[PDB]
Design a protein around this ligand. Structure first.
Ligand SMILES: CCCCC/C=C\C/C=C\CCCCCCCC(=O)O
Ligand SMILES: CCCCC/C=C\C/C=C\CCCCCCCC(=O)O
Lengths: 158, 158
């Protein structure tokens, strides 16, 4: 239960659409170190279901190539928290729907933790990056990556 | 000439001895991404020469093993700036000699840039890490790593 920042008033339907993983951080280096690392995933689109589950389109480098993944985060009794089917919960820390979204993924244990700053456009948002860094300043992150606009328009951010 | 933080009054003899690379950052992900990445070096000891050159003992992972390296930074007319023989200049941004040292290495071009927060002891110094983050906040860093006390007592921080 390491993360104690959640979005109050979250309307999950309003996060539907295109996002860019501007920045990522994790608790352990190995979670993001290699391009095939377990939590180095690049968000493409969020597709909230009518009953409040969250289908996720993303890219991940596997076996020497940029692969497409589709996964579903199921709703919980808490609007800002979803569970991935594999126990790994996803939490929405903050979002303004129109520009940025900060979320973390953590495992039930440790804990193991990865967070991203998502943005709507392939641009460096300094002010979403500051909110991201503010949110993680107490979290025990040991790796942090960010991407430039060119990489953001590339599959797997090459 | 991207870095415009240098230590005034630097006495290079007083940086001799044992250091730990508590944290590292770089301008491009690939400079630190892999464990065999070009700038993922782990400082061991600094050995200032009598005439002001700076011999450096460090570790770097090469060809599937933690290798020992010994390199020399030659003095320039500027006390806080040394050149490595290979044009890559090293700059000392700040140090209190007894606890922390911040430096950057950059190539003549880009520029390509790597900085570290060095510390005397295998401990997380939050206040040297804040000075490190403050010094890099305007620099265009896209990867950032930090190590825990256990890793700090391991060769190549395993
Ligand atoms: C509200 C926004 C939420 C966005 C959530 C984004 C990603 C979901 C979290 C983690 C996904 C785990 C890694 C990808 C799994 C694919 C299988 C694998 O290769 O291991
Ligand atoms: C005042 C403290 C200065 C400390 C300087 C530390 C390191 C020097 C900077 C860069 C070293 C380049 C990478 C190692 C070179 C070995 C050859 C290689 O494998 O490419």
């Amino acid at each position: 239960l390491i993360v104690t920042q959640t979005m109050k008033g979250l309307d999950i339907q309003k996060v539907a659409g295109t996002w860019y993983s501007l920045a990522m951080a994790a608790s352990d280096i190995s979670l993001l170190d290699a391009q095939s690392a377990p939590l180095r995933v690049y968000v493409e689109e969020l597709k909230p279901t009518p009953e409040g589950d969250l289908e996720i389109l993303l890219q991940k480098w596997e076996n020497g190539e940029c692969a497409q993944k589709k996964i579903i985060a199921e709703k919980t009794k808490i609007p800002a928290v979803f569970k991935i089917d594999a126990e790994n919960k996803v939490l929405v820390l903050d979002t303004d729907y129109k520009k940025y979204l900060l979320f973390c993924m953590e495992n039930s244990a440790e804990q193991s933790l990865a967070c991203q700053c998502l943005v709507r456009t392939p641009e460096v948002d300094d002010e979403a990056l500051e909110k991201f860094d503010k949110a993680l300043k107490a979290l025990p992150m040991h790796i942090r990556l960010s991407f430039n606009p060119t990489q953001l328009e590339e599959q797997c951010h090459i």
